[PDB]
Amino acid sequence: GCWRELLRECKERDFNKQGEIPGPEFLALVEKFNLDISRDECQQLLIKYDLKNNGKFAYCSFIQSCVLLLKAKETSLMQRMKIQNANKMKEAGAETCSFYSALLRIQPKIVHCWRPMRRTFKAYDEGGTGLLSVADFRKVLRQYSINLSEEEFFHILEYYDKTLSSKISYNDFLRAFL
Amino acid sequence: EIPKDDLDFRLAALYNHHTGTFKNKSEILTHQETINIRHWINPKKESIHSIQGSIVSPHTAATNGGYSRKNDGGFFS
Amino acid sequence: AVELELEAVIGFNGHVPTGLKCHPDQEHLVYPLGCTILIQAINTQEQNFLHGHGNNVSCVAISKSGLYIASGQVTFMGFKADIILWDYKKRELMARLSLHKGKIEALAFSPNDMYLVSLGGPDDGSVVVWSIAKREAICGSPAAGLNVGNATTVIFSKCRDEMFVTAGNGTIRVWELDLPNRKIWPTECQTGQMKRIVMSISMANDDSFFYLGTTTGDILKMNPRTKLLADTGPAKDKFSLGVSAICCLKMGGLLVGSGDGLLVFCKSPSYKPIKKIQLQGGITSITLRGEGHQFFVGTEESHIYRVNFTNFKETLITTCHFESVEDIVFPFGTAELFATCAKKDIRVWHTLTNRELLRITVPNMTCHGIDFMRDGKSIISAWDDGRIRAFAPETGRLMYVINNAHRIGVTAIATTSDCKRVISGGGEGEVRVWHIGHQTQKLEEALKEHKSSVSCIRVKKSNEECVTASTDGTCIIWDLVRLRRNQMILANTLFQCVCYHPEEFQIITSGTDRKIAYWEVFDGSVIRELDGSLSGAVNGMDITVEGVHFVTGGNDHLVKVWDYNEGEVTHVGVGHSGNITRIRISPGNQYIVSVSADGAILRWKYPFP
């Protein structure tokens, strides 16, 4: 609910891009945005989640678990769902921190325009399958002002195309937004 | 550019009268108006083995003392 | 003696086989240099180049774990070429392994580290097998079959004990290591009739097949299990020069790079150019960044490319020379441009973003020195063919040529402020002043004192005198209203560079005795003798406008800011051990730029003395 605030007031004190920030610089600054706090939560959420054996805490993984789905639990029955054509991806993944950062930067745009975006995914070389080419994927993304750099596209494509097959599922990409 | 109807029909019309089979009036008179690092390379591509000049010495520059010996001595170039 | 920041380094040595690598957590790039190993990230920060080897590097290798980096160096005939292990968490020397004579052609790691293999020696061809757990030598043998020839490279399979050396002249051998017997077992691969010379090597991921990049232009697929030829490469439209960079992918495809710039994505059973792009220079290294979506290209001339795998769009990210560079010359007034010269190339660089704006080429030649004019109308250059050539500052058009300037190549050069007189000195010893007109270029007088090649010539702000230095040990003060000599400067040092002190009352010299010496303009007497390096020599000199800051470039890795009045050093050169031949300072007192005897240029930051 305060994800833009915890990102804007964490990338400024980030010294160099991938470099995370140490413990109290997180614990004291969750009080800056008045997050609900408890020491029992703090101990595990700091020490257990320091996945490089350092004092810095990975912001991207935590807020990735906070806002971006990437793992559905089907949310019980009698609950309407949104993306309907997924599970056509042959278990790919690298999950770098820069992948999560690129996902978070693209996040506010896709949720605004995904009802017309999915249909231009469809009308551009589908037939009924559910797989588009990489170049057509880039062309469809640019037509809705989602512009991806070379590093951003590398980290995007390393998760949705492991076999270098030049085909990318668009529903499974759109599933980790809604 | 056309002060006369004849120049309107001529010149600026793209209708070829030899390869135009059975066009109508509206398509004869269709008009044209309706429609990082820089490198310089020497051309003569010469050799290191085509240099004009002196014959270089087998001995070093500061050591031509025991070999130079212009008949009755004397340092060379 | 504080250490000021090195802003950037521009060099790259693409002359070594498979020199450019990428280490597998996907942010850094490892490519060698003249003496060190450079590490470059996405952001333009140079992360602590690795000092060692005491001489030029020859080959590089890296571990799949990303924890160990290997490198090999060249040494004299009949001496030891030491392999230095490196770590990455704390980038320091880990071990010195010295069991080779001459050079080290190739190194390779096992998939889970431990073992190290070192094929080295074009004269003493042998292979020893190391360990990195304990840093001793296990076993070895002459790893080149008699009556065949030499061997070039090595590579490792996924079994920790099967390595395979590359046919320098027709000896393809797949090896096997026996731990308890302390032996290695050679097995020749039986080829029917094709005797090929192969320089580049590759191995598939699941050890099914390995490929060879041969001289003739074909790619030989081979099976390590049966040790027999599997497939033969393309028969029509063979690759032009010898394939020097071959890499494989997760699928059966392979990235093959030729020696004329042909990076080709190809196939296994019948090799065809599915997608190819043309690059400048012969491709020498191909390494996959993380899994294949982007990768890196090394060329013979120092270019580094980044081309995506989808539809093959390349991006040139780094340019440099490929030989010894000398005589950087700054334009007057502005400081955001500077010019360079080396073998076959004269290039003008942007100094803020460290990029190249233009290059001019006279092939198969080397430029001894360059100079500008007062306003940027031409770049006079002193080539080795006895010619002096002048190019336009952009588009490089040849303005004129002086045909037989000297009996050997022109070594030094100068420029007067009135854009009328050019002073040049040849390898014969002649100092020649030249008249430059609008239509004709003449020779007023050749001045004749020196008995050796002229190192450097510098003139005063009033275009009236000049000092010419030579390697015979004389520096001559000429005049310009008349063309005559005033006084001699005799010393026991082969002079390399001279510099006028502002207010024109003192003259400083240098050479290969490591003694910066002050002299008077008249009477030629000594005043003081300083210390240059205590080990090497002194080669690069410059003094700024204000006259108290003064820069010395030695034969070692050190650039030294010196106080003019005292002898005080502000040591900054923790950089590159290539021989710093010439040096220069910014006109606006912002930067110190130096050159090296390898393809390197270093740019430092200005302190105040």
Curated annotation (Swiss-Prot), chain B:
Transmembrane segments: none annotated. Microtubule inner protein component of sperm flagellar doublet microtubules. Expressed in trachea multiciliated cells. Microtubule inner protein (MIP) part of the dynein-decorated doublet microtubules (DMTs) in cilia axoneme, which is required for motile cilia beating. May play an important role for the maintenance of myelin-axon integrity. May affect intracellular Ca(2+) homeostasis. It comes from the Eukaryota. It comes from Bos taurus (Bovine). It is found in: Cytoplasm, Cytoskeleton, Cilium axoneme; Cytoplasm, Cytoskeleton, Flagellum axoneme; Cytoplasm; Cytoplasm, Cytoskeleton. Residues 59-77 are annotated as: Disordered. This is Cilia- and flagella-associated protein 276.
Swiss-Prot record, chain C:
Gene3D superfamilies: YVTN repeat-like/Quinoprotein amine dehydrogenase (2.130.10.10). WD repeats lie at residues 52-96, 99-140, 146-185, 278-317, 320-359, 362-401, 405-444, 449-488, 490-531, 533-572, 575-609. GO terms for biological process: flagellated sperm motility. The keyword Cytoplasm applies. PROSITE patterns: WD_REPEATS_1 (PS00678), WD_REPEATS_2 (PS50082), WD_REPEATS_REGION (PS50294). InterPro entries: WD40/YVTN_repeat-like_dom_sf (IPR015943), WD40_repeat_CS (IPR019775), WD40_repeat_dom_sf (IPR036322), WD40_rpt (IPR001680), WD_repeat_EMAP (IPR050630). It is found in: Cytoplasm, Cytoskeleton, Cilium axoneme; Cytoplasm; Cytoplasm, Cytoskeleton, Flagellum axoneme. Microtubule inner protein (MIP) part of the dynein-decorated doublet microtubules (DMTs) in cilia axoneme. Important for proper ciliary and flagellar beating. May act in cooperation with CFAP45 and axonemal dynein subunit DNAH11. May play a role in cell growth and/or survival. This is Cilia- and flagella-associated protein 52. It comes from Bos taurus (Bovine). The gene is CFAP52.
